[PDB]
Design a protein around this ligand. Sequence first.
Ligand SMILES: [Mg+2]
Ligand SMILES: [Mg+2]
Ligand SMILES: [Mg+2]
Ligand SMILES: [Mg+2]
Ligand SMILES: [Mg+2]
Ligand SMILES: [Mg+2]
Ligand SMILES: [Mg+2]
Ligand SMILES: [Mg+2]
Ligand SMILES: [Mg+2]
Ligand SMILES: [Mg+2]
Ligand SMILES: [Mg+2]
Ligand SMILES: [Mg+2]
Ligand SMILES: [Mg+2]
Ligand SMILES: [Mg+2]
Ligand SMILES: [Mg+2]
Ligand SMILES: [Mg+2]
Ligand SMILES: [Mg+2]
Ligand SMILES: [Mg+2]
Lengths: 109, 139, 252, 175, 190, 201
Amino acid sequence: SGRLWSKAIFAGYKRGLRNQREHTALLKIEGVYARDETEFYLGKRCAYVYKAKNNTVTPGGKPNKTRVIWGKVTRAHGNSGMVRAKFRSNLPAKAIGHRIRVMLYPSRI
Amino acid sequence: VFRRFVEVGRVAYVSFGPHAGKLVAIVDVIDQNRALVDGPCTQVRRQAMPFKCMQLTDFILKFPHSAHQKYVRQAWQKADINTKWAATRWAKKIEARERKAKMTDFDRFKVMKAKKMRNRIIKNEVKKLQKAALLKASP
Amino acid sequence: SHRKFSAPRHGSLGFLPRKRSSRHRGKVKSFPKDDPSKPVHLTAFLGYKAGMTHIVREVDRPGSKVNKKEVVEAVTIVETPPMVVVGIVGYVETPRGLRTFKTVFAEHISDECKRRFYKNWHKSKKKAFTKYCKKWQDEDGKKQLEKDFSSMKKYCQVIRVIAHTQMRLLPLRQKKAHLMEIQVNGGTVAEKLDWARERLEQQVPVNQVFGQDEMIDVIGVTKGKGYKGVTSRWHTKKLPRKTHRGLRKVAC
Amino acid sequence: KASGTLREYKVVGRCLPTPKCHTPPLYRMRIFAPNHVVAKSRFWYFVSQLKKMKKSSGEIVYCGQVFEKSPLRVKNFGIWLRYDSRSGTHNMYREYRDLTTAGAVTQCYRDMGARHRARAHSIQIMKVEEIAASKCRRPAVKQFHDSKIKFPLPHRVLRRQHKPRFTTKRPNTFF
Amino acid sequence: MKTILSNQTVDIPENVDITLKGRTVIVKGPRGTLRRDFNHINVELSLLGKKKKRLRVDKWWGNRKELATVRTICSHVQNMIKGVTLGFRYKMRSVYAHFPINVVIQENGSLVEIRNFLGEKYIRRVRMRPGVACSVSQAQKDELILEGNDIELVSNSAALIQQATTVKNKDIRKFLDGIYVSEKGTVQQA
Amino acid sequence: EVQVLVLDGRGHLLGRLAAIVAKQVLLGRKVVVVRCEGINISGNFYRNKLKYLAFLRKRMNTNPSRGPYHFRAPSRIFWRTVRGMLPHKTKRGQAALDRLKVFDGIPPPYDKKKRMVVPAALKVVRLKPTRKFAYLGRLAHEVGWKYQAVTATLEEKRKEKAKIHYRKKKQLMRLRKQAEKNVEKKIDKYTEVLKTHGLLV
RNA sequence: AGCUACCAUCUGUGGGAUUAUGACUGAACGCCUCUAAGUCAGAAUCCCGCCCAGGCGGAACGAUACGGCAGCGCCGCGGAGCCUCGGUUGGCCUCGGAUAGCCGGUCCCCCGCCGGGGUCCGGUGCGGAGUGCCCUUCGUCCUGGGAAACGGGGCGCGGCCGGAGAGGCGGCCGCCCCCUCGCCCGUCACGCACCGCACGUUCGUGGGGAACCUGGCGCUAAACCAUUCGUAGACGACCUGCU
RNA sequence: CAUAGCGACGUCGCUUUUUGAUCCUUCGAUGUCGGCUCUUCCUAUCAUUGUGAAGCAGAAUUCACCAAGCGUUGGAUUGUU
RNA sequence: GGAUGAACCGAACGCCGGGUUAAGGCGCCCGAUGCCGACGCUCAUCAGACCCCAGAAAAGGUGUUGGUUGAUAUAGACAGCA
Ligand SMILES: [Mg+2]
Ligand SMILES: [Mg+2]
Ligand SMILES: [Mg+2]
Ligand SMILES: [Mg+2]
Ligand SMILES: [Mg+2]
Ligand SMILES: [Mg+2]
Ligand SMILES: [Mg+2]
Ligand SMILES: [Mg+2]
Ligand SMILES: [Mg+2]
Ligand SMILES: [Mg+2]
Ligand SMILES: [Mg+2]
Ligand SMILES: [Mg+2]
Ligand SMILES: [Mg+2]
Ligand SMILES: [Mg+2]
Ligand SMILES: [Mg+2]
Ligand SMILES: [Mg+2]
Ligand SMILES: [Mg+2]
Ligand SMILES: [Mg+2]
């Protein structure tokens, strides 16, 4: 019917120059390029959706190749509209530069 | 080449800053970067203001430099700058931006429907005009 | 510290990949710059080094010691049977260089020319260009050929002719002919295409390409000498007789 | 001494009374400082230079900000100062145009830093005075004394270079 | 210091007209048309009157270096007016001690051959800039006349001739030979 | 984004555009820079040519065939500049570098598409009007590039075709304006909705 | 014979931007000034050409496997399925450009009925606007009013044209076969309404590989070794020949 | 005639092709002079290209600039540098 | 943190989650200015760019920018031409 989630990019992990804190990730939401625009997305659920080789059970559906690592936006990062996200398991490094969905679920509007 | 000038009595539109979206009059000039600025009828009290956040309009008021609020306000009210401003294409472009921004979901749906029908009618007329212009045969 | 006496370098670094040539024929690598004011002509030819001899002639060099004098000069004989034109290649200029746009081959490709397309001619079924030559007869293939020539006419900047030598006229063992793209210079693209098209299947003698007492360039592969040391390869100085592990070497 | 937007302070101090003078004289200075703590420190610096006073042997009886008596009027400020260069000390007279005296002194500090690389600890502001437009001496200040001043804004640089970051239309600089 | 405004005005004679296409000045007069663009300078050009034809050059908020360009543009425009009304004529004299410099003016005054400069057998061929005509004066025995509409083109051709006739490997204070611009003036003397 | 971002190289500053492009391709975005001969470099031409000649001088003394590869085409120069801002010795950097295409002129896949512009890299806004600059095409040509003339000829043909297409588009838009004038009694009902909600002033 | 020697003989090359420098016009600084803006000439230097090599870089073209069941190519999205790789979740089909200026439209002059100029009229914080535009997905059934009815659909055929920089694309006609439906506002009720819940929704008939069935139209080849050569050579490699 | 070419008294530097000063690396070892051979690099340019200056008439020479493309040799004595 | 580094700057250490800082930073590599940051200075045909620190002096410049002192000028300066 429609997209129903905001597009975001897994830009990278929270890090210094030479230290990397993989437990939290940095997301670049499309169209959000200022810190004051990020207040809408705080607390929203976010998902890293990908495919694999073996079938896994799908809630309310038949098993397929789709797998999800769930998470949520925790706070803003930087002045340019980055956000920080905590996922149930740390995001794999192959997902850098790939799609994250921000799901609008815990709505406050 | 230039047509709009910084000068006493020139009406400027504030693009950004604390007074964004308001009209002011230039009362005086300070050191090439700032201007003594006064909107008595647009709710901008007299203050310094950089030239970077100004966008000059076509209206020029006639009062001497560094006059008081009384004379600036009479110059503004006589030959009303508010209505003459709202009549311009600039002001109603701003107003159209504002009312497009404040449009709700139901309003977006209604605009989508109206624009759908409008575009279809216009496209049919364009096709008719194209076929009417395609019947040319002249050596 | 600096070397004590100055001496020029041995050998030229302009020929550094001092390796076996990847080709046996010797490719042109630069054709003469094309100017449309000239008449349509070919820019190169293929010959075979027969041998050397010498001649006697009188010199007409004023102010020289040998003016109006007899000289004996060595000459090389290059046997040049007529080339046979069997194809046309169009090239188009791109911001990545010249690229081959379209190739059109003539009907009736000679047997010695067809030998060039086979590594083992003896075992071959001789099938090369057999289906291609059929398109010079049907109406559809002829229309496609006309479209190819029109595309070359309107899109190609330089054109070249495929020409092959005639092994059957030479005393050599080899029967496999030599193919070559020879550039056609001197006109508009349409004019040189018409000229090359009328020369298809035809013979071009060497006197139609080169004239008397003009200076040309010869391109070829030199005589092989096998694996050689530095003394014979770069002509470095031989080390003294007292040298222990060998003297035909570069010391440092 | 660092900076910000400077403020004017009237600082009045005196020596502590002793059984040599029960009423020592009161001394007043204008200090242009970021805040009252720095203002008191600079007051002690200057009165230690001029009189034979110390922060320990004296006290500060008043330190209050001096508000501009006409912040809505453009006026010309002459500033007499001295500063240490890399190779000596020089006295300077500089002119500025501003609504506030403190703003003019801030302009002076920035301009000295820009033109002479003079840091704020090297600069000693010794006089600030509003001057008549006929008493001005700096042509960059004098050229704004036109009752019919008029100039355009010739080459207006786009400052919103990242909203949008990517666009089809190239910017216009003529307005 | 940035100066608010620096302006300079050039009067245009009645027999010549000036057209502005941005910063491209087209000056059309009795002797031809001179066209020159000043797009490398950020100034404002305007034609003021419909009566006496003033052309004003304005520079706003210019520092010392770019306030120097206003009078440069004005002088270039005045030279264009002068070229299209009176033209430019440069008179050169050939000076020599022993070997006479033989000058032959080839096709339509666009080529100059210097033959016997310092007695050497090299023939100097100098090609005039387009629009510049060289000729041999009928008033003086050793004199070239270069005539044209563009002062820069005429003087550039004169400099080409002068630099072509250059003594080398000798004391030039003693070997004074060569062709030197004697005077710069106009045609029609008006 | 998900589409290919096509950027016109004309009027853009080299390092500014290269920084923008490098960040874009590191964010997993397909970027295609066309007309790389139109890229500008701040500072006068002799200075920029001297910089590239110093780059030419830097070569491996023992075996120059292994040394730095000095690419002479403007597209390859810009590609190497972007590679200098990418972490090209890791897999992430190599993938980001793969997501970038550079061209001299505008090739047929992209001459029929709209081209974006980066204002933060534009010379007109990033450079004072009195400063001097160099053209990447001219610098490349004088430092070893061979295809300045043929690229210019093909660009001129492309511009002629684009002028024809633009005339067709103008004629179509004039016809559309005439159509809107022709049907207005049957259009004003929806025109009022659009005007009410701010579309179509 | 072969190899070989300044111990014999032959051959060895063209542009460009410019350095130093000398100048032009010209301010700054009513003069002057090679310099500030703008120009000129300029070299054993520099870069390129000529020349040597030719990328984990491309192009064009040729031939593409049997006389026996024997392999392959194209056409049908033709079917039934497997194995594997995953990304993505509407499109924009394009003036050239200037920036101390632009854009649009229109009457007279010139060039093939369309463009270029000169007017004139508009817009310019770009609204003929990428802060934009287009498409817009719940589906049907009664059922009226408007848009259209010179209209939409054809993985339907046949024909034409344009596009070569990497055209891998796009456009237009003729025949035939459908429905008067799809677009807006209304009338009318219905669909699993799966009892609050995630990976839903697209590209997509995705890419790639083996294999089965089903038809049609087509093809019948080379490379390498072995042998020979000696224009080649440590060995490989290379140039060759073989009813 | 200070400054074509030089430069006293003073004074500011650069270089690491001299010789020192030091002793950081190497004493379960980095083969220690010169020559021969061979390649490359530097410029603080001897020659050649293009220039400027002279107490540059010409010739020769001298000073300086861009400049390291190219060249800088055969011998007697000496282990020699 | 200073790219790199025994000693510099910050800070000293059990295994972790969240918040906030130091010194240092925020075009891209590379987290962070994608602020409509402020005012000036500066063009370099060897520009400049951050403690230790990793290169420079005396002496000059009619490049430009400020400042100090002095002088001339409608009783006509200054510069040009005579
Ligand atoms: Mg030597
Ligand atoms: Mg021995
Ligand atoms: Mg002499
Ligand atoms: Mg020899
Ligand atoms: Mg003059
Ligand atoms: Mg010069
Ligand atoms: Mg030149
Ligand atoms: Mg010790
Ligand atoms: Mg050992
Ligand atoms: Mg050893
Ligand atoms: Mg030197
Ligand atoms: Mg060499
Ligand atoms: Mg560290
Ligand atoms: Mg460091
Ligand atoms: Mg400390
Ligand atoms: Mg923590
Ligand atoms: Mg850093
Ligand atoms: Mg970052």
